[PDB]
PDB file of C-alpha atoms and ligand atoms in Angstrom:
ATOM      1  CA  UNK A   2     -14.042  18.007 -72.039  1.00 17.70           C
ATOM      2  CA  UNK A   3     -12.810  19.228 -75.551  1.00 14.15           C
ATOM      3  CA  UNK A   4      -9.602  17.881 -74.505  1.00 13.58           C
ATOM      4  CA  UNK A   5     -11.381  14.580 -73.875  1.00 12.91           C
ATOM      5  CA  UNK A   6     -12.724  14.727 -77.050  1.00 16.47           C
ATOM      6  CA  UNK A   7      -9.103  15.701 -78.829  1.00 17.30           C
ATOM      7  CA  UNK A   8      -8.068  12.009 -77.204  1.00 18.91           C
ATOM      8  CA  UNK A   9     -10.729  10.044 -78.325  1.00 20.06           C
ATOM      9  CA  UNK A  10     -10.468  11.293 -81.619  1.00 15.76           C
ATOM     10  CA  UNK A  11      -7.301  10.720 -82.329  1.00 18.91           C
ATOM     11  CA  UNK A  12      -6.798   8.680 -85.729  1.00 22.48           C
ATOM     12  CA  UNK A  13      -5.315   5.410 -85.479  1.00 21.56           C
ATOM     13  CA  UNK A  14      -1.733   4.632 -86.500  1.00 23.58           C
ATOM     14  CA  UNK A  15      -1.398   3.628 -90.320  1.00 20.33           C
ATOM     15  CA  UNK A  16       1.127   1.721 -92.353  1.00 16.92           C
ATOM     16  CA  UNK A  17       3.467   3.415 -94.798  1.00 16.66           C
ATOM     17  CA  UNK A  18       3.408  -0.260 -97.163  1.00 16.14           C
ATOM     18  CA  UNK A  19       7.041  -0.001 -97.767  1.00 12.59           C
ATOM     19  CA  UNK A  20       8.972  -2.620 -99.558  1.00 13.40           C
ATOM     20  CA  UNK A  21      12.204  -3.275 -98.296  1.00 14.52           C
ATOM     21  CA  UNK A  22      13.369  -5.851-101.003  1.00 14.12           C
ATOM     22  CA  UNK A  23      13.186  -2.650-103.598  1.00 13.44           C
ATOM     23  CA  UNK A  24      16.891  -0.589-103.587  1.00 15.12           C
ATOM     24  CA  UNK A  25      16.761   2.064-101.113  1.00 16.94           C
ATOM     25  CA  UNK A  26      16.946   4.864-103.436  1.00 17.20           C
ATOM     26  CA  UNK A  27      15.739   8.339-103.083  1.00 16.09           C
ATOM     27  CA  UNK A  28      12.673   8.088-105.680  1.00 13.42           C
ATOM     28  CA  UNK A  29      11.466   4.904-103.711  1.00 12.95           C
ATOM     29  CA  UNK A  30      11.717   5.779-100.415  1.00 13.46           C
ATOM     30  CA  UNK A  31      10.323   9.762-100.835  1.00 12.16           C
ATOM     31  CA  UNK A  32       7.398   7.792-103.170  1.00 12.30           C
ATOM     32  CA  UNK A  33       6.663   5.696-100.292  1.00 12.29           C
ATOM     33  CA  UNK A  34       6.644   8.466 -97.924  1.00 12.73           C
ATOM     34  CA  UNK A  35       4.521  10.123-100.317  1.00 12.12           C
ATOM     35  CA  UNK A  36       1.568   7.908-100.299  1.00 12.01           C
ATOM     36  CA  UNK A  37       1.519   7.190 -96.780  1.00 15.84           C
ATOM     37  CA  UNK A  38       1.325  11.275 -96.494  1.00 19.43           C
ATOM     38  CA  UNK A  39      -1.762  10.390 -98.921  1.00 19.46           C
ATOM     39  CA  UNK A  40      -2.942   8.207 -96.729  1.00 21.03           C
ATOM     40  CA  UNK A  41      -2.463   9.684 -93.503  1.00 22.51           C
ATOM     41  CA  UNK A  42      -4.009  13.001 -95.440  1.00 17.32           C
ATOM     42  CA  UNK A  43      -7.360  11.048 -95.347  1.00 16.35           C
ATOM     43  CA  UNK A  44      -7.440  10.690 -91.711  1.00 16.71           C
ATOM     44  CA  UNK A  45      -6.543  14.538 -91.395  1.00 14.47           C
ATOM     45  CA  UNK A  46      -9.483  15.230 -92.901  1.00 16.00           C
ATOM     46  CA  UNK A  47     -11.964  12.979 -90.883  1.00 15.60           C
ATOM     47  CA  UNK A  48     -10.236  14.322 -87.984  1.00 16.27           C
ATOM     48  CA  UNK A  49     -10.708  18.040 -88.810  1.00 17.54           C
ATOM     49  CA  UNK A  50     -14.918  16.775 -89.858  1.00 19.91           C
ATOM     50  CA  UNK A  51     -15.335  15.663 -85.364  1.00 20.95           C
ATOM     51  CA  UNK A  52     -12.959  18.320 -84.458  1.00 22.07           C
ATOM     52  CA  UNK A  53     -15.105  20.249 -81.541  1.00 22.16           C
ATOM     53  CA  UNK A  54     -15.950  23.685 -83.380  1.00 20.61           C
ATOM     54  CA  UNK A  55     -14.543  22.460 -87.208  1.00 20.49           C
ATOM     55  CA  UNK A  56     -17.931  22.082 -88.706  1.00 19.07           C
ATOM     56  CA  UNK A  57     -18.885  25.998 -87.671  1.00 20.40           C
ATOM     57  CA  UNK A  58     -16.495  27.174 -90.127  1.00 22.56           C
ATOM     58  CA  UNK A  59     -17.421  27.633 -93.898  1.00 22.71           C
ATOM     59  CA  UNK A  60     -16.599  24.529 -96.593  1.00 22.99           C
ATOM     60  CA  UNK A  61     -13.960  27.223 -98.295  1.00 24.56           C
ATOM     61  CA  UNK A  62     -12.205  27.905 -95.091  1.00 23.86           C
ATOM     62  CA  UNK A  63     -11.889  24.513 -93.628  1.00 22.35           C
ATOM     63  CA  UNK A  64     -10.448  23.473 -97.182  1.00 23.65           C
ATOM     64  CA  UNK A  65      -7.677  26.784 -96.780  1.00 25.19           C
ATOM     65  CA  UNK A  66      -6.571  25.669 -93.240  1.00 25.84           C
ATOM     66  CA  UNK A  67      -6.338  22.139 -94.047  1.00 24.24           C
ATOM     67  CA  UNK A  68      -4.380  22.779 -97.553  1.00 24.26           C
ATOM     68  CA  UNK A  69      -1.931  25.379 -95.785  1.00 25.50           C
ATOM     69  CA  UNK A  70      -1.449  23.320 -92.601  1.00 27.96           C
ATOM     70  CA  UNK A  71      -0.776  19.673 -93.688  1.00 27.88           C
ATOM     71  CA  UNK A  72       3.350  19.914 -93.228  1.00 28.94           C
ATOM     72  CA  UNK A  73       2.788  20.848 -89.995  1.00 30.07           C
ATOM     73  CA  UNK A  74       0.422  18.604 -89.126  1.00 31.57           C
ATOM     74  CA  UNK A  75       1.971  15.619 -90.761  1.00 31.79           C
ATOM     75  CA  UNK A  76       5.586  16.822 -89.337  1.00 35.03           C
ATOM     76  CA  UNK A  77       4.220  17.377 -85.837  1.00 31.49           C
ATOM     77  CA  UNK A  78       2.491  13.954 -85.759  1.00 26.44           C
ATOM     78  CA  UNK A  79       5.817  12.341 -87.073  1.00 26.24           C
ATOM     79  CA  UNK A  80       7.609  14.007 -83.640  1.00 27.80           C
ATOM     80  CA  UNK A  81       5.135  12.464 -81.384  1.00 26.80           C
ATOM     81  CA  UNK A  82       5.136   9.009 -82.264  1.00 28.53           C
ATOM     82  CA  UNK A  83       8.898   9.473 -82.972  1.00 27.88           C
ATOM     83  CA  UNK A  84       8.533  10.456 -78.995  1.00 26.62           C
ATOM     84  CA  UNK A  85       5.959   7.654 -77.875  1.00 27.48           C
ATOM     85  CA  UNK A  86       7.392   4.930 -79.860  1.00 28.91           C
ATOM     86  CA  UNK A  87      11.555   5.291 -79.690  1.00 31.17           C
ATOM     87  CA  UNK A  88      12.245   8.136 -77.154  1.00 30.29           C
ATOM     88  CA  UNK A  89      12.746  10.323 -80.392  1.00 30.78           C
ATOM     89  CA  UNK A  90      15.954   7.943 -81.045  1.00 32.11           C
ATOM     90  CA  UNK A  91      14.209   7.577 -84.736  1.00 30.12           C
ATOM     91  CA  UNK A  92      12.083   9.177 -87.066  1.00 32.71           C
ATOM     92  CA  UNK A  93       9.299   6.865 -86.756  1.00 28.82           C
ATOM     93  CA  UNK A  94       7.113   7.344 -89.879  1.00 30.13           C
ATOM     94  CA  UNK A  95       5.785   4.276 -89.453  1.00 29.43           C
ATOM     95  CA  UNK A  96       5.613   0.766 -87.645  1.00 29.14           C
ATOM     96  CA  UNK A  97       7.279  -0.298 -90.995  1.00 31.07           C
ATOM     97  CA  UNK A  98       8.868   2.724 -92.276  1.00 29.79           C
ATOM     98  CA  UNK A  99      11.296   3.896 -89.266  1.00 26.24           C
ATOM     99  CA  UNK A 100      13.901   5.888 -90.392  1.00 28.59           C
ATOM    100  CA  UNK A 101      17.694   5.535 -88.663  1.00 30.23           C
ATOM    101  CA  UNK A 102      20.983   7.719 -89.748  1.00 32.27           C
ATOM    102  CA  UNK A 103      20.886   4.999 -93.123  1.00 30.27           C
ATOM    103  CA  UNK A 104      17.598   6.164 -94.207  1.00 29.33           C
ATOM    104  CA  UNK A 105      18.211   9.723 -93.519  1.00 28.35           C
ATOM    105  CA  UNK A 106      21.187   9.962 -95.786  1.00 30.95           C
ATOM    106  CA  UNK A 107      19.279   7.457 -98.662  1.00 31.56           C
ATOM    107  CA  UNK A 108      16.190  10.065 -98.832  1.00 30.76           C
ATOM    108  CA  UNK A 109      18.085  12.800-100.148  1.00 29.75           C
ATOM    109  CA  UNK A 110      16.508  14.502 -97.573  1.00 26.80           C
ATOM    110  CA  UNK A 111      19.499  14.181 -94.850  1.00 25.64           C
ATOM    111  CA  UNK A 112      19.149  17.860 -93.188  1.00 25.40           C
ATOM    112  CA  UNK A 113      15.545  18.232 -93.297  1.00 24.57           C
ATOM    113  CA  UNK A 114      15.420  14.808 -91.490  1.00 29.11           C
ATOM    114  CA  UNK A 115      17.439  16.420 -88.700  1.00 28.95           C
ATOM    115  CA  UNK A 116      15.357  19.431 -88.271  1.00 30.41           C
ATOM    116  CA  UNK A 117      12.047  17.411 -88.175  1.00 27.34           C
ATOM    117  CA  UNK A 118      14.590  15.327 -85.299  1.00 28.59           C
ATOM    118  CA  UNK A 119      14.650  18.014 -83.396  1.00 26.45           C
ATOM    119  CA  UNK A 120      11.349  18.875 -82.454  1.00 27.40           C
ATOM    120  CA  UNK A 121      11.079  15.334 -81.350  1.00 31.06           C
ATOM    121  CA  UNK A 122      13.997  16.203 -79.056  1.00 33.87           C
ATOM    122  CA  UNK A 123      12.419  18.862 -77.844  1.00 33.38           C
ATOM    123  CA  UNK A 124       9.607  17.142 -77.465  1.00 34.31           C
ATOM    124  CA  UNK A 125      11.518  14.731 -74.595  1.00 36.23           C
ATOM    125  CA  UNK A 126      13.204  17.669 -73.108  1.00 34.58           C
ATOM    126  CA  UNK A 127      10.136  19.322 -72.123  1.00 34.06           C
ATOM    127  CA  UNK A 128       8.394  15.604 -71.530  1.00 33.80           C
ATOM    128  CA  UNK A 129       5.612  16.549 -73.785  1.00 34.44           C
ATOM    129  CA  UNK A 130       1.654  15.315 -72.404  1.00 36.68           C
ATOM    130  CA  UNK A 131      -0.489  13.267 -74.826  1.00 34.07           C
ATOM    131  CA  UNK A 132      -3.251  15.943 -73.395  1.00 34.57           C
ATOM    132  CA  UNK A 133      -0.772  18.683 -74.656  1.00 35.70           C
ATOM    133  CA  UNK A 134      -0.210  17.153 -77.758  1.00 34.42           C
ATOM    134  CA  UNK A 135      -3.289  16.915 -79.402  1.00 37.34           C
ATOM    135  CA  UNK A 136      -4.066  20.693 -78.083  1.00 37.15           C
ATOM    136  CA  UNK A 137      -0.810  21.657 -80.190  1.00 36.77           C
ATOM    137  CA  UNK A 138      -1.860  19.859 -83.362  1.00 35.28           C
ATOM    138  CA  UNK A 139      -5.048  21.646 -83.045  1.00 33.43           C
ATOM    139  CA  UNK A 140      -3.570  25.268 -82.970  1.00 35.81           C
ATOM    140  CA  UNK A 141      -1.634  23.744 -85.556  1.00 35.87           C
ATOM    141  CA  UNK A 142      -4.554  23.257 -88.188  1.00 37.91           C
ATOM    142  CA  UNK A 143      -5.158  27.144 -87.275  1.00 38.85           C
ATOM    143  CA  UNK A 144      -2.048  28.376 -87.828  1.00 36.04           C
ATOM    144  CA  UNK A 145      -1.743  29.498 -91.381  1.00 33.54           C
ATOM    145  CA  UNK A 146      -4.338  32.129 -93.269  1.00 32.45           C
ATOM    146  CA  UNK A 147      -4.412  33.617 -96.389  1.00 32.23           C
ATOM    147  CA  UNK A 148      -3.028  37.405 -96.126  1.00 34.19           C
ATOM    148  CA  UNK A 149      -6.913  38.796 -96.593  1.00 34.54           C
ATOM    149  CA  UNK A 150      -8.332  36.474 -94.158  1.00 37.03           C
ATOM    150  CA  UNK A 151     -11.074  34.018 -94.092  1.00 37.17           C
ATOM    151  CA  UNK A 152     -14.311  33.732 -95.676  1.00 35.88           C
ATOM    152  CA  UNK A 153     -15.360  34.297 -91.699  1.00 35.51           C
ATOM    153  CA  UNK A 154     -12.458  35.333 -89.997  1.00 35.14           C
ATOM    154  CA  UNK A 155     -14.187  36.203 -86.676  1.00 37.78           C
ATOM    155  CA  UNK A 156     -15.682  32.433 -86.478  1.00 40.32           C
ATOM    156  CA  UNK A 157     -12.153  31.372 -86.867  1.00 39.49           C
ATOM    157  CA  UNK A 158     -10.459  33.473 -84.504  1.00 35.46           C
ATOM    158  CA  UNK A 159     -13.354  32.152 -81.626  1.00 34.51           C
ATOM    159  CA  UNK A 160     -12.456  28.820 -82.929  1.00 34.36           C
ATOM    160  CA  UNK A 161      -8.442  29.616 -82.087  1.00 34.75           C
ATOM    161  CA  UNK A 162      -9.067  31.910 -78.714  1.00 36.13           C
ATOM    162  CA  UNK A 163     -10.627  28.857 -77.463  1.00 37.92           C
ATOM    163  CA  UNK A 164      -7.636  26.420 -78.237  1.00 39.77           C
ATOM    164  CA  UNK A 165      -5.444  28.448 -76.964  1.00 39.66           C
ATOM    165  CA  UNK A 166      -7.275  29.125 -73.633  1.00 37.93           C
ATOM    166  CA  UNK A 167      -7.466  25.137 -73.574  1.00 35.16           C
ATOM    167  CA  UNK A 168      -3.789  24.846 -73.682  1.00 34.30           C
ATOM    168  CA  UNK A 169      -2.908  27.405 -71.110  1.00 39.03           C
ATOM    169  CA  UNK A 170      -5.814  25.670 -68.641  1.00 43.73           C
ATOM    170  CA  UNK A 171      -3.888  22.199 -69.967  1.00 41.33           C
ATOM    171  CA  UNK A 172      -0.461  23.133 -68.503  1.00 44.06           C
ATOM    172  CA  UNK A 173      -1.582  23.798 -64.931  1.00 44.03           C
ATOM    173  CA  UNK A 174      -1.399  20.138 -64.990  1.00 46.52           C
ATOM    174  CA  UNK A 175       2.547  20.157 -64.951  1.00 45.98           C
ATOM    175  CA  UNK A 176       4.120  28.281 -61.861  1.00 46.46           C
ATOM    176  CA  UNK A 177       2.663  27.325 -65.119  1.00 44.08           C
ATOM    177  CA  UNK A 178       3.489  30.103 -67.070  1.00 43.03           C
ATOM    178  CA  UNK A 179       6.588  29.086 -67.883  1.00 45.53           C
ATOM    179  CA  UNK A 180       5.437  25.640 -69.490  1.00 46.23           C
ATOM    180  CA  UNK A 181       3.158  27.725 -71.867  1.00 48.19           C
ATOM    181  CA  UNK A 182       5.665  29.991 -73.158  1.00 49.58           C
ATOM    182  CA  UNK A 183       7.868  26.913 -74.092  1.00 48.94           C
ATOM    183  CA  UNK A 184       4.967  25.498 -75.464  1.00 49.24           C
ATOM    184  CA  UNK A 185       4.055  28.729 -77.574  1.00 52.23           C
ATOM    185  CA  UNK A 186       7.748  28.706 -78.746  1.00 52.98           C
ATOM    186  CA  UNK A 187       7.948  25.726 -79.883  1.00 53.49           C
ATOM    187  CA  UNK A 188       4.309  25.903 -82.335  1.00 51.68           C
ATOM    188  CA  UNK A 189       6.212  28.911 -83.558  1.00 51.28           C
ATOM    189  CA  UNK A 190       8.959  27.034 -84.633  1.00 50.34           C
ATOM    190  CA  UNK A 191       7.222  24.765 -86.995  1.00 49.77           C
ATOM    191  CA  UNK A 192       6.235  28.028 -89.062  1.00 44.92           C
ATOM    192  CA  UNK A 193      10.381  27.816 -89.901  1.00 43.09           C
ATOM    193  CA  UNK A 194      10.719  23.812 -90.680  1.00 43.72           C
ATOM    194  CA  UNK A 195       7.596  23.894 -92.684  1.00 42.97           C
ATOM    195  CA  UNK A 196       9.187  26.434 -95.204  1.00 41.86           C
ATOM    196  CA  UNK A 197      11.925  24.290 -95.487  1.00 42.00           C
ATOM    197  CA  UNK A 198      10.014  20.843 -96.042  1.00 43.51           C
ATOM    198  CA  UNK A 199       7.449  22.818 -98.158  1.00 42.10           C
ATOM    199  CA  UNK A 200      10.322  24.214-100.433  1.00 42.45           C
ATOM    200  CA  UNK A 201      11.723  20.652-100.773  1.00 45.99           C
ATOM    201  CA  UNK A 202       7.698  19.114-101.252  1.00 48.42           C
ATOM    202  CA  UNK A 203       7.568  21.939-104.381  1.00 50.10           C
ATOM    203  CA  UNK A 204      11.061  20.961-105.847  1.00 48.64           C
ATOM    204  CA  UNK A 205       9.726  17.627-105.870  1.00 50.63           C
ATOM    205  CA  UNK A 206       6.297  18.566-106.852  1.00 47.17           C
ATOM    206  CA  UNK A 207       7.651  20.181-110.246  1.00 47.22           C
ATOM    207  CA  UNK A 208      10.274  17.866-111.029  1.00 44.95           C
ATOM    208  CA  UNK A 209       8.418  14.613-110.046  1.00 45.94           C
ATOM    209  CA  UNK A 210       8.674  12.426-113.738  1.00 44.58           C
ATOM    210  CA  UNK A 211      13.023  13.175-113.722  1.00 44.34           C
ATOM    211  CA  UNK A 212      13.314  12.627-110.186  1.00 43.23           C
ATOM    212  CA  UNK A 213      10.773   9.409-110.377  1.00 40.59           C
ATOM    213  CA  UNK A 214       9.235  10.624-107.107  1.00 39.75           C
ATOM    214  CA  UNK A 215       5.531   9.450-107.552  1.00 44.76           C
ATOM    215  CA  UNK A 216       2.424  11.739-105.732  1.00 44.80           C
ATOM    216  CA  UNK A 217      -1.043   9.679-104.785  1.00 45.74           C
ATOM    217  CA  UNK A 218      -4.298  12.254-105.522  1.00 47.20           C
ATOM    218  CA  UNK A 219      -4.608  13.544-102.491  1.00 48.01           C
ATOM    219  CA  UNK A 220      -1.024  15.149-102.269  1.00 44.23           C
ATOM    220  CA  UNK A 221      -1.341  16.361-106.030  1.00 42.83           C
ATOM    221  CA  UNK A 222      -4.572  18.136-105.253  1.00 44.44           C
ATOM    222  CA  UNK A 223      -3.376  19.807-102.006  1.00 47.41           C
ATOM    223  CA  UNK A 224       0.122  20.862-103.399  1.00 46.55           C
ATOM    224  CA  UNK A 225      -1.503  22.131-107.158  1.00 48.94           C
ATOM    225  CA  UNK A 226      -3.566  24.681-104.946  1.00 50.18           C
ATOM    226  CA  UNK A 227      -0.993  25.614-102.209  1.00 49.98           C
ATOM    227  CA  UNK A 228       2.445  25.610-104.238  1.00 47.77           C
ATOM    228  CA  UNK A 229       1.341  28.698-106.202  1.00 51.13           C
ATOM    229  CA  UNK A 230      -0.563  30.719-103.307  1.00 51.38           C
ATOM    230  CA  UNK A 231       2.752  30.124-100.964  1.00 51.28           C
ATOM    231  CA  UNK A 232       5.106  30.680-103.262  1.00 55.47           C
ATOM    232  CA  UNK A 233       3.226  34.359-104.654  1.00 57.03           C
ATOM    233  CA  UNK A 234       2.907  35.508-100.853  1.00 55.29           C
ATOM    234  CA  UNK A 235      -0.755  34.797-100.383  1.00 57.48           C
ATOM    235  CA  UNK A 236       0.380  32.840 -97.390  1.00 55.47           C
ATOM    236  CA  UNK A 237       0.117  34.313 -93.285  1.00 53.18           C
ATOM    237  CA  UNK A 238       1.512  31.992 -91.151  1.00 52.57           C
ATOM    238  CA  UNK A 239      -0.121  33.093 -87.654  1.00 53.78           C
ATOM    239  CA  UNK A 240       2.583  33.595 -84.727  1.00 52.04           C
ATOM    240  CA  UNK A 241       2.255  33.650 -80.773  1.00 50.60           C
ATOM    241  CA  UNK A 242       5.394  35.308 -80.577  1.00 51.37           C
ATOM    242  CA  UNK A 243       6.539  37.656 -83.438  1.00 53.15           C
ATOM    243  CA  UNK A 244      10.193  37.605 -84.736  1.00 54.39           C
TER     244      UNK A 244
ATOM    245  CA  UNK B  15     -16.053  18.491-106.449  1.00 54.31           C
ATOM    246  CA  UNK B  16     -12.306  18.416-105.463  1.00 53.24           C
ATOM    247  CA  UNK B  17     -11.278  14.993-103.133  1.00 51.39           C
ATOM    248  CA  UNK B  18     -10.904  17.574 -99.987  1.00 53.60           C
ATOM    249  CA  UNK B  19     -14.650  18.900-100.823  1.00 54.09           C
ATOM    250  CA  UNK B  20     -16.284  15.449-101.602  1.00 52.78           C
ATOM    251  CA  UNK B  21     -14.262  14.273 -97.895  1.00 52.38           C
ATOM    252  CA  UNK B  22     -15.547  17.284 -96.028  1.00 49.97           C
ATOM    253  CA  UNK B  23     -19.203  17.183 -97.112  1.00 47.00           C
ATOM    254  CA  UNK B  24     -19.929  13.299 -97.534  1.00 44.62           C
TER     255      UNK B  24
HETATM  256  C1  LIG C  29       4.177  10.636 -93.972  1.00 39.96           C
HETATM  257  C2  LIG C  29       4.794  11.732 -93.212  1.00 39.96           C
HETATM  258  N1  LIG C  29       4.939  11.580 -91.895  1.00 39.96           N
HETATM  259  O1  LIG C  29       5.533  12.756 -91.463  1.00 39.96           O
HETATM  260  C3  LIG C  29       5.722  13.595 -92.510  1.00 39.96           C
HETATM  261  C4  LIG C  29       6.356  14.881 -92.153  1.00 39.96           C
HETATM  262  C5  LIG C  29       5.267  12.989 -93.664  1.00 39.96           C
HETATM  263  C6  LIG C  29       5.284  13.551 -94.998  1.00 39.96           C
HETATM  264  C7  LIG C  29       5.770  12.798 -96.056  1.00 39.96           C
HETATM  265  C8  LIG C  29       5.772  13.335 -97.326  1.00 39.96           C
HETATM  266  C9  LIG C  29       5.326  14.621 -97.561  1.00 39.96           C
HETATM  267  C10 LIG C  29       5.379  15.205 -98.941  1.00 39.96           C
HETATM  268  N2  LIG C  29       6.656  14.912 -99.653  1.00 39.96           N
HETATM  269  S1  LIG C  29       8.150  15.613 -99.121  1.00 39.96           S
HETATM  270  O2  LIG C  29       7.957  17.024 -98.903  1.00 39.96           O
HETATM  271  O3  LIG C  29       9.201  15.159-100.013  1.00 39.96           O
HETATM  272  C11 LIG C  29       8.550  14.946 -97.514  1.00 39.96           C
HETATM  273  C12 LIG C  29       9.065  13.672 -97.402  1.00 39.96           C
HETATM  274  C13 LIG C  29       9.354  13.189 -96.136  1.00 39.96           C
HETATM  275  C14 LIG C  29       9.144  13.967 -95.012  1.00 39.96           C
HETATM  276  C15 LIG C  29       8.647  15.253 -95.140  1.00 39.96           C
HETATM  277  C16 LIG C  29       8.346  15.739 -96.399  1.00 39.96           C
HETATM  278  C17 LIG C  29       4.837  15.366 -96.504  1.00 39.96           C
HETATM  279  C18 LIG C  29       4.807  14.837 -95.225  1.00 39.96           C
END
């Protein structure tokens, strides 16, 4: 039933309104990614609003997990239809924005593409469910805190205790304790990525008029609020498995 | 109100 619900609630695919006649420089193809992060930032939100047990949590604290869990939610999105739509051959950003070894290299953004490539490999190796999926992205939205907790840290904690419990009941589906170890492992590893994009995002972020790289509202709003709270610490990224 | 607040309560 709340996995039902995850399904049905799913936001629908949007465009990233890329212009391909423009040069394929770094400034216009990271702005272009950078609105359709805007964009797709919307949906997050009215996602998060029908989410089954969102609404219980505080207006402060659903603001803090969405602001501190965007990159992963934007990156882990950008795996799956990378999986649906190519096999994970591509990064596909987009039904017009689909980035091959080319666009990679012309982002400036070459070795971060890779390591957002490879949890779209690993999402083929393990032959990822939609019904896993959109558990996942879930426990993703709850996966970063600030270091002195919520504004009603035991609410949230139900909230996540539940998720989880769906995805363990999920991978009966396909010995299942093995599955949700893999599973576990791998939500872990977007703590690591994320740094890395987020560092790149910041660099960006506070060098945007040299580098040309425009930001829509959305992004400027979310980054001015989480740049300085991850970069002084305030961050806890939350961890199945503890390295 | 902040875009995330005026998107969360509307
Ligand atoms: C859209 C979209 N689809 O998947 C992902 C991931 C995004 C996305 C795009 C832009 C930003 C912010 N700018 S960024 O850090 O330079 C950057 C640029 C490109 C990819 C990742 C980070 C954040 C997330």
């Amino acid at each position: 039933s709340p996995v039902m619900v995850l399904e049905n609630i799913e936001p629908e695919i949007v465009y990233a309104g890329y212009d391909s006649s423009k040069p394929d420089t770094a400034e216009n193809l990271l702005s272009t990614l950078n609105r359709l992060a805007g964009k797709q930032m919307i949906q997050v939100v009215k996602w998060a609003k029908v989410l089954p047990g969102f609404k219980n949590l505080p207006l402060e604290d659903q603001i803090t997990l969405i602001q501190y869990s965007w990159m992963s939610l934007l990156s882990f999105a950008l795996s799956w239809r990378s999986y649906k739509h190519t096999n994970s051959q591509f990064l596909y950003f987009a039904p017009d924005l689909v980035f091959n070894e080319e666009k990679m290299h012309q982002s400036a953004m070459y070795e971060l593409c890779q390591g957002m490539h490879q949890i779209s490999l690993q999402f083929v190796r393990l032959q990822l469910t939609f019904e896993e999926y959109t558990i996942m992205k879930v426990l993703l939205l709850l996966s970063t805190i600030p270091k002195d907790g919520l504004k009603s840290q035991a609410a949230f904690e139900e909230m996540r205790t539940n998720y989880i419990k769906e995805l363990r009941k999920m991978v009966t589906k396909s010995q299942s304790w093995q599955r949700f170890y893999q599973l576990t492992k791998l939500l872990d590893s977007m703590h690591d990525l994320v740094s890395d994009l987020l560092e790149f995002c910041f660099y960006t972020f506070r060098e945007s008029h040299a580098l040309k790289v425009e930001f829509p509202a959305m992004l400027v709003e979310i980054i001015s609020d989480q740049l300085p709270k991850v970069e002084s610490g305030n961050a806890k990224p939350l961890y199945f498995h503890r390295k | 109100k902040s875009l995330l607040q005026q998107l969360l309560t509307e």
